[PDB]
Amino acid sequence: GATAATFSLSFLNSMQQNTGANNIVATNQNGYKPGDLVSYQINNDGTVVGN
Amino acid sequence: YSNEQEQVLGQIVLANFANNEGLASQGDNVWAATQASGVALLGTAGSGNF
């Protein structure tokens, strides 16, 4: 029942060269699942960050 | 197996980090990924940087 997310997929910096084999370098996205706080800290610049 | 046939069940993946010293030890000879260590780069043995 969850509506699909429409996202822009970018293949930037991809190169096709004579590698030993095809190698995937990096995959990234800005989504995440629900999660509860497990830790909190204060960084050296004053920021409070919760993990 | 007995029928002179072999089946692959899986390949052990290996991980390498930007900063090995940045890993946080979790006890019982186990490490955890942290910011300092950077994100785990996965791969197979004998290829790439493994």
UniProtKB/Swiss-Prot annotation, chain A:
It comes from the Bacteria. It is found in: Bacterial flagellum basal body. Belongs to the flagella basal body rod proteins family. This is Flagellar hook protein FlgE. It comes from Salmonella typhimurium (strain LT2 / SGSC1412 / ATCC 700720). The gene is flgE.
